[model samples]
Target chain A: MHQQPIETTENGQRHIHQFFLDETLQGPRPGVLVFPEAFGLGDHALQRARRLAELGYAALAVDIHGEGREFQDLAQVRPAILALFGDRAAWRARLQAAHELLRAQPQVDAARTAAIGFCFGGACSLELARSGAPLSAIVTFHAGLQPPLEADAGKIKAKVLVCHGAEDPLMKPEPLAAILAELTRDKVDWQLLSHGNVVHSFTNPDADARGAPGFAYNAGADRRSWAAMQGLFAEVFA
Target chain B: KGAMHQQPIETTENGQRHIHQFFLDETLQGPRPGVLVFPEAFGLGDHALQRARRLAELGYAALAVDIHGEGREFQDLAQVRPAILALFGDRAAWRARLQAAHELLRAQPQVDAARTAAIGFCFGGACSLELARSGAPLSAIVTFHAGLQPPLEADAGKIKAKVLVCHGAEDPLMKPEPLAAILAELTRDKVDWQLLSHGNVVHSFTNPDADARGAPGFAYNAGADRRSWAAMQGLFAEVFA
Candidate 1:
């Protein structure tokens, strides 16, 4: 794996989104951009990039929460996520820059690019989908299922998949159902996999360590959701 | 890839219940982990048998249990509901039936009693969970497309098994409120449990016969089937190892 530093601006505010790419590919292939949970680019995102590489894709685990900065606790990362959620234009621009960064990679097949995210990154993935970015597919795992703007529903160009947890108190049924309704109204190709008895951060093995309610790792949901995401990738990137 | 035989098990209430046991005779040369397979409301049929064979192909001794004794078959829910209720109503009889089959499985020379698990689909799913609640010596228990409520008030301290519940999110039969109660019980008991709630699938997700029946609450889903199976395989590998 190779780390490529990318500098981009949103409303004249410069932000660094370090793109970690799988450098072993012989030629240009499908690119998958991975967004992290609340905690920035760490072992989980890097391991996911490695997994994507094993699946014969050029993976870029995009850095959203600043370069050379890491937060160990949800209390620390919550503000960053809330800030991103609060700023509509900045959020859009940051995600767009990350998308462009993947397209600029020499080993990425521009036409066969997709995005996936975990938690906060999942929201970032949907934001990228909402921007009408030219992506083949978008997948989110245990993310907040709220659309940034209902008006931007018409701008989605990617096939979307939202893998959520049925027991996640953070993401209740009403908001999730509303998101599905909006996706349907826009005639977007979308699917939602609600994993039963699973809380938020189902994919993160260290979720319970956070000492937070409504967040725990579920092996069944994690494996099933990953398999579902892989199936979508195979279909969309083909 | 596998061979199957009918293992006769007799209980006081249900006599002559023949359990269909499958194993990879060609590939499995030594004793291996054993798994008890539970059937849906239809009883021990082709769907449950196929799943048993699959476990055998994966190098485990699998037994598709017969909850109902000889000459008993439910062609419709009308017949099925009462039989299921009868077993639920008489927990001692149900436990005795399960114990008889468990003893037969343990008696098999090819099965390692210490390394055993259980899997159930639909009504059988509830049976598997109940098996754990009964303090049966199982390493793991899995329920696919099942209702989660356990019939007995489990002594959480007695359960020696990890549990996985694979259910359909849209299933009309197993609603959220009751499922929440089950989850709370598991948590209270400190049972190692997981619930895989698959979307767009209903009850009997793993049975192809579900699609043939054209029932409202039943349908066969290839995705849920494959994924839930993989989930079980992962759990079995962890516990059996």
Candidate 2:
């Protein structure tokens, strides 16, 4: 199985950079954008995208931070994220641009398209949905929730699924509670699954043993969440 | 989507399981730099192995080394902790293992080890440091959030290879005393080194998790990870140039 990533920029200046072609053209499949974590489109993200491809979906691992960005330290992630989050206006524009780019792909069934992200990526996916970008579902793993601009009960368009770790220290109960409250107020179509005995980044095996400064990779959580995602994707598409 | 294949080679059959090797050699090379990858505490898992394949497609030869032997696969914290402790247990053994791996890599027909550098995550980061200490033939060494474990004599002397260490400032495993000792050692030894710290970043910043496991040292600091990795790649170009 191979994913031939075709790079195209919105314009010559390269405002929107993507790594995939029309899946429908290759065969018959829906288009999806796999927004990567703050670490950008590293191997894990690409692998995850491939998993989506195996599911008969044309998944493109979109680069959130332009091109040529490598995962280094948290400092690098902050500025990139800040640039997107500091102003809601710019953030919305960027996600819409990328989403449209995917929808515009020749073979994608725009009606059945979706978006999923990890960590920072979760925020990106939510922003895309909140911005009213057309997406059937938004699935996020260990993602940060974005409060709707207003409790606009009607504007929420995408179905959202949040796979969270109960023990994740970065954005624990406080932030999660806020997201839940917003979802309730908005009456948003969403599924919030909290796995006990798991911290953030539960899907990545690398986090489990490193015992690094932040995040734990729970194998159990990773498997369960991934399985849940597959089910959710199939359900929404179905 | 991509196809993943894991080929494990046993350099030694000893039950001790000190030295092991696994490589994902993609097409020779083109734009991206080929890498001699070191493993984290979990050794080569889907994360690292999949990364190697990704790098391979990007026109890099990602040689991932297994620090432990068969049956030593990490099951959880309890299983991996002792293995990590033992690898860092002695300077002589660590250096010896790395040196052996380096030589073997240099000898691989498919490798451009001459332009080769070492990039390690977590414990692999420290292992990359050993590559420097052992005087292995590497153009550079890149470490991500590794403990500052050094040879007793390292502070008093200099190491030959260029080094880049990407660290999480808030990482509990790396405190001021040991940090200062490392800095002093680098200064005293006259080794060429660069340090990039993400002040808000905790450990495992690259794992893409909003929170960390309740484990003693695990944390994620995105700030530290992104910058550090970019820095390492830049240093690779600068030094290799």
Candidate 3:
């Protein structure tokens, strides 16, 4: 396994990203673009990429935050991240650029590309699907269920899988309804699997360390969602 | 569309035979996991039968235990309350029935006994819990809008199965103390368990026909039902893996 740092520009903005792959697998393998959490790219996303690489996928840890920085104090970054969530255009643009970058890689099977994200990254992954990115699938763990625009849904090409925490205070019923309405309205191929008594950042072990309400690591949910993801990928990539 | 049959197991109390229904999908080519389905207080009716068939559809051998011997199905709370209340007072009697049902399930050739799980509704949830409490070698146990029962401290240590309970926060029967006690018992024994408490939700949230019962605080919740079902599947994937 190896990691390579790449700097790329999209819409006149520069961002640094990390790519992970096994040097020994001599074939065009499926590519997975991993989206980081709201606190930006760090060990958690990097670990996700490494695990994907181990599973025989060429993975790229996307840097949507652009400055190649990781945030320590979420309080200081909350306002900025919230603003980015409302900036759909820029979010969509960054996602496309990253997906394109991943698909263009020499070791990647462009036709078998998938995207996944956690928390903030999950919203970005959904944005990628909404951007009409040519992806075999898009999976999100504890993602913000933002309704895609009417036009965006019509252009989506990826099959979607949402792994959500039912008890997530961050995601109430109304948002879930909107996302469901948009998906059903647009006729996108999708599945939303919800885990009971679970909350945000469930996939990240550091979720508990964050010491915040509505954020904790659930070993059961984390394992269950990953199994669900593998099941979807097997069907999609088959 | 698959295979259906009945098995009669003798009960310890009166030597009365309890008839349990089994559903198997022959089209599903594999040694399927076995699931013991305990019915609501009303016994095995259309709802629980449908739930059993649903499991069969998902490639599992499902056994719906006839808690009431001779395959009896009740309607009114007048009829159900007295019968179940009697059984509840005698934990030994109900647990015996569950054990017999589980024994019948494992002996079936089509089922992968090692991957057995139990699921129950309302009154039946306590049956499933008792099965776990009796130290049945089940891989998992799931209950929806169930009658949450706090186990005896000694009984709690006997649970080997991973447990998932989906509750309705607003269920009048589900007082906070009992809820906390159930959780506390599981925690005390370090049993693998999860509680999915749907806020502002009432009992039988998983049953669309719950309203037909005219029971207060027993209403259907679409979102809670979907999430709880998914949660069960999620646990199945892990525990049955």
| lDDT score for residue B166 of model 1 | 92
Candidate 3: clashing pairs of residues:
none
Q: Candidate 3's residue-wise lDDT over A1-238, tens digit each?
A: 9899866533223467899999777788999999988888999999989988988899999876665778886786798777777888876765676777788778999889999999878888888888888888889999875765766657778888899999998778788888878888888898988999999999999899885789999999999999888888888888
Tell me the DockQ of each model, to 2 decimals.
0.00, 0.01, 0.00
State each model's CA lDDT, in order: 0.79, 0.68, 0.82
Residue ranges of candidate 2 with Cα displaced over 4 Å: A8-26, A151-153, A209-212, B1-241
Q: What's the alpha carbon RMSD for model 3?
A: 25.6
| Model 2 Cα lDDT, one tens digit per residue, B1-241 | 1643334544431212333334443334333344667766766555556555655554455667766654244746578787568766667666766776676566565566666778788778888877777666677788887776845674355366787778888888777678777777787777788888777666666654325456655666666666776787688668656
Best by lDDT: 3
- Per-residue CA lDDT of model 2 for A88-173, tens digit only, reads 77777767766765665556777778998888888888887877777888889887666556634456588888998877775678
Q: Which residues of candidate 1, in runs, are more than 4 Å off?
A: A1-238, B1-13, B16-19, B151-154
Chain A TM-score, candidate 2? 0.88
Higher TM-score: candidate 1 or 2? 1
The chain A TM-scores for the candidates, taken one by one, are: 0.91, 0.88, 0.93
In the range B1-241, model 3's lDDT, one tens digit per residue, is 3454334343322323356678888777768799999888878777788788878877788888777666788877687888777777877766765675687789889888788999998988888888999899999999888886666756848999999999898888778888898888889899999998999899888778887878788898999989998998898888767
Q: Rank order by lDDT, top first?
A: 3, 1, 2
Off by over 4 Å in 3: A10-14, B1-241
